A paper describes a structure:
I20A/L25A-HNP1 crystallizes as a tetramer with two independent tetramers in the asymmetric unit of the crystal. Unlike wild type HNP1 and most other HNP1 mutants, the tetramer I20A/L25A-HNP1 is not formed as a dimer of dimers. Each monomer contributes equally to tetramer stability with a combined buried surface area of approximately 2760 Å2 (as compared to 2280 Å2 of the wild type HNP1 tetramer). Tyr16 and Phe28 make up the bulk of the hydrophobic core with contributions from Tyr21 and the adjacent disulfide bonds of Cys4–Cys19 and Cys2–Cys30. In addition, there are two core sets of hydrogen bonds in the tetramer center that help in its stability, utilizing main chain atoms from Ala1, Cys2, and Cys30 and the hydroxyl of Tyr16. The tetramer is further stabilized by a hydrogen bond between Arg14 and Tyr21 of one pair of subunits. In the present study, we also discovered novel quaternary structures in the crystal, including a form of I20A-HNP1 that appears to be unable to form dimers or tetramers and a novel tetrameric form of I20A/L25A-HNP1. In the virtual colony count assay, whereas the I20A and L25A mutations each made a significant difference against S. aureus, they did not make a significant difference against E. coli or B. cereus even in the I20A/I25A double mutant.
They are small (2–5 kDa), stabilized structurally by three disulfide bonds, form oligomers, and are divided into α, β and θ structural classes. The canonical dimer interface of HNP1 is formed by the antiparallel extensions of the β2 strands stabilized by the reciprocal main-chain hydrogen bonds contributed by Thr18 and Ile20, and the hydrophobic packing of the side chains of Tyr16, Tyr21, Trp26, Phe28 and the Cys2–Cys30 and Cys4–Cys19 disulfides. Further analysis of probable quaternary structures by the Protein Interfaces, Surfaces and Assemblies (PISA) software indicates that the HNP1 dimer forms a tetramer or dimer of dimers in a crystal.
Residue numbers in the entry:
A (entry chain B), B (entry chain C), C (entry chain A), D (entry chain D): 1 to 30
The structure:
């Protein structure tokens, strides 16, 4: 699955983009 | 976790954005 | 993490997009 | 599995596209 994470992805996940939601930029991570 | 859905996110989810694939726009729901 | 798979996502993976590589479409699976 | 890397893919991966996050562009590699 994928996640929107603040402030970065977590160990074992990779970043592929950015979620833009509630005035924050979240890492798009899977 | 987040999922692409049509027509809508499911009770309990938040629409964080939009996916695009197979000719369609999808709710991206986390 | 994410794979660009043909023909389908595998096992617990779900689709988030479409990879395109010189005319070939792949499922973006994560 | 696919990843986003600067400045290019690790030799052996194919460049399937471009990622954009954190204000930078990355090779999308699988």
């Amino acid at each position: 699955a994928c996640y929107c994470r603040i402030p970065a992805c977590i160990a074992g996940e990779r970043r592929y983009g950015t979620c833009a939601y509630q005035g924050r930029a979240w890492a798009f991570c899977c």
